[PDB]
């Protein structure tokens, strides 16, 4: 029942693979909603096409800037910010999906994925969904981050949707 959804990543525009993502519409339904509107881009705006902006090798991929391309923008189908849903869900280990913020009650379309257990952003920012397949992609993807974030090849969303 619960939507997954994929994205194509390319690197430097050659194709890298696929990695598909299960959201946990039961759980955080808002917000497994709006990463899916998002990535169908079925509102008119989305992922499609947008980079990730900042990659810590051992910590998290962060992307869904897809109005500044680098950490400042982005918004929700909902508005500009919208409200934590819940914290039920805990960053427990690589793989995790998780709502990137400003304070409380900020969210818009930035997300990162973890590549690290993350248990000290517990009750700070909203899980909503997990790694389903090719998480040796997401793996991939950090070789071309470094410490400060920066990457030295642009990561990018060639193509994005639902499959179920």
């Given at each position: 029942?619960?939507?997954?959804?994929?994205f194509?990543?390319?690197?430097?525009g050659?194709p890298?693979?696929?990695?598909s993502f299960?959201?946990?519409?039961?759980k955080?339904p808002?917000t497994?909603?709006?990463?899916?509107?998002?990535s169908?881009?079925?509102?008119?705006?989305?992922?499609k096409?947008?980079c990730?902006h900042?990659i810590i090798?051992?910590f998290?991929?962060?992307?869904?800037?897809?109005?500044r391309?680098?950490?400042?923008?982005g918004?929700?189908?909902?508005?500009?910010?919208?409200?934590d849903?819940?914290?039920i869900?805990?960053?427990?280990?690589?793989?995790?999906?998780?709502?990137?913020?400003?304070?409380?009650?900020?969210?818009?379309?930035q997300?990162?994925?973890?590549?690290?257990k993350?248990?000290?952003?517990?009750?700070?920012?909203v899980?909503?969904?997990k790694?389903?397949?090719?998480?040796?992609?997401?793996?991939?993807?950090?070789?071309?981050?470094?410490?400060?974030?920066?990457?030295?090849?642009?990561?990018?969303?060639?193509?994005?949707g639902?499959?179920?």
């Amino acid at each position: 029942v619960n939507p997954t959804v994929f994205f194509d990543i390319a690197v430097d525009g050659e194709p890298l693979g696929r990695v598909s993502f299960e959201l946990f519409a039961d759980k955080v339904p808002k917000t497994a909603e709006n990463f899916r509107a998002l990535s169908t881009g079925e509102k008119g705006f989305g992922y499609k096409g947008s980079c990730f902006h900042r990659i810590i090798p051992g910590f998290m991929c962060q992307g869904g800037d897809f109005t500044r391309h680098n950490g400042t923008g982005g918004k929700s189908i909902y508005g500009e910010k919208f409200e934590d849903e819940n914290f039920i869900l805990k960053h427990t280990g690589p793989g995790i999906l998780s709502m990137a913020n400003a304070g409380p009650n900020t969210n818009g379309s930035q997300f990162f994925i973890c590549t690290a257990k993350t248990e000290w952003l517990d009750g700070k920012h909203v899980v909503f969904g997990k790694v389903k397949e090719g998480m040796n992609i997401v793996e991939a993807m950090e070789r071309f981050g470094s410490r400060n974030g920066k990457t030295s090849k642009k990561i990018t969303i060639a193509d994005c949707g639902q499959l179920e």
